[PDB]
Design an enzyme around this catalytic site. Structure first.
Site, PDB file in Angstrom:
ATOM      1  N   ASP A 133      77.349  35.865  51.138  1.00  0.00           N
ATOM      2  CA  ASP A 133      76.156  35.074  50.909  1.00  0.00           C
ATOM      3  C   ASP A 133      75.213  35.771  49.934  1.00  0.00           C
ATOM      4  OD1 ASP A 133      75.281  32.780  53.341  1.00  0.00           O
ATOM      5  OD2 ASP A 133      73.862  33.270  51.785  1.00  0.00           O
ATOM      6  N   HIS A 188      68.697  33.074  52.801  1.00  0.00           N
ATOM      7  CA  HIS A 188      69.873  32.411  53.362  1.00  0.00           C
ATOM      8  C   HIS A 188      70.867  33.321  54.086  1.00  0.00           C
ATOM      9  CE1 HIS A 188      73.529  29.741  53.005  1.00  0.00           C
ATOM     10  NE2 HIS A 188      72.551  28.938  53.374  1.00  0.00           N
ATOM     11  N   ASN A 192      76.458  19.863  52.020  1.00  0.00           N
ATOM     12  CA  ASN A 192      75.342  19.036  52.417  1.00  0.00           C
ATOM     13  C   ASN A 192      75.090  17.780  51.609  1.00  0.00           C
ATOM     14  OD1 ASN A 192      73.483  22.143  52.896  1.00  0.00           O
ATOM     15  ND2 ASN A 192      74.983  21.267  54.205  1.00  0.00           N
ATOM     16  N   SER A 202      75.579  25.273  56.213  1.00  0.00           N
ATOM     17  CA  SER A 202      75.526  26.733  56.163  1.00  0.00           C
ATOM     18  C   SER A 202      75.025  27.343  57.478  1.00  0.00           C
ATOM     19  CB  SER A 202      74.588  27.228  55.100  1.00  0.00           C
ATOM     20  OG  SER A 202      74.983  26.926  53.776  1.00  0.00           O
TER      21      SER A 202
END
Ligand SMILES: [Ca+2]
Length: 269
Positions: free
Chosen positions: A32, A62, A153, A215
């Site tokens: 990430d 994130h 998404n 996520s």
């Protein structure tokens, strides 16, 4: 005071903790934006594949949030991860904008495979197929890593890459009603779903934040895979993947939900 986020209770992670399973001895790579130091996280190591960035510090937020859903420490502060004793490794493949290249993501997967990670969490996607990605997922799978990846998404009926490939376990997102979250991509290749709406977790600057996304769903499944690996240390990546699907709570049609909601109690029975 430590709070248990709704998603951690929904996948029944406390029941597996009561059996004494916490992910101890399981190595989990979070591919990430990095993971920042936080009082409710213990980061074991990692590597950066972002050009000109030597550190694995999180410049976005994130990666640190995803890390906390997998392994926020079980103590008197913050939140609680699905597998609070897992060994976390920060593999920084996305920059501060949350973007990366197929070359940095593929290098991260190769590092995970070469450094004996048990689980690699990819809360990321590429809109288009990439032979490089497919090859790197396959390489990491052959070396023994279970790759878990977000469906994406956009709300569309096809899922993103690398989640769509056969050797990636694709994770979609549910809400508090156990319905598919409207943004959660679904379709061919979807394996399982997990909480992905208003997920509170660790954030840079020693704080906490609530986020939405596939996520956020992906780390719940990476965490339950670490609990199963602790219970069953000889099991392969494929065995763990199949057991998670086999013990998930069915929620309807598999095109929308895969096998259903990951269930850590049923998976560690
Ligand atoms: Ca905590």
């Amino acid at each position: 005071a430590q709070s248990v986020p709704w998603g951690i209770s929904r996948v029944q992670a406390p029941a597996a903790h009561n059996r004494g399973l916490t992910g101890s001895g399981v190595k989990v790579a979070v591919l990430d934006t990095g993971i920042s130091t936080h009082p409710d996280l213990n980061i074991r190591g990692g590597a950066s594949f972002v050009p000109g960035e030597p550190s694995t510090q999180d410049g976005n937020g994130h990666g640190t949030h995803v890390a906390g859903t997998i392994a926020a420490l079980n103590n008197s502060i913050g939140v609680l991860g699905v597998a609070p004793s897992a060994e976390l490794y920060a593999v920084k493949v996305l920059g501060a904008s949350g973007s990366g290249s197929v070359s940095s993501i593929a290098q991260g997967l190769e590092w995970a495979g070469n450094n004996g990670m048990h689980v690699a969490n990819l809360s990321l996607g590429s809109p288009s197929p990439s032979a490089t990605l497919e090859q790197a997922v396959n390489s990491a799978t052959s070396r023994g890593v279970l790759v878990v990846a977000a469906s994406g998404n956009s709300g569309a009926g096809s899922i993103s890459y690398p989640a769509r490939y056969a050797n990636a376990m694709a994770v979609g997102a549910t809400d508090q009603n156990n319905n598919r979250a409207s943004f959660s991509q679904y379709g061919a290749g979807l394996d399982i779903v997990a909480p992905g709406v208003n997920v509170q977790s660790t954030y840079p600057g020693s704080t906490y934040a609530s986020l939405n996304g596939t996520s956020m769903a992906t780390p719940h499944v990476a965490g339950v895979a670490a609990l199963v690996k602790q219970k069953n240390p000889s099991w392969s990546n494929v065995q763990i993947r199949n057991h998670l699907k086999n013990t998930a709570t069915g929620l309807g049609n598999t095109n929308l939900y895969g096998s259903g909601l990951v269930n850590a109690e049923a998976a560690t029975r």
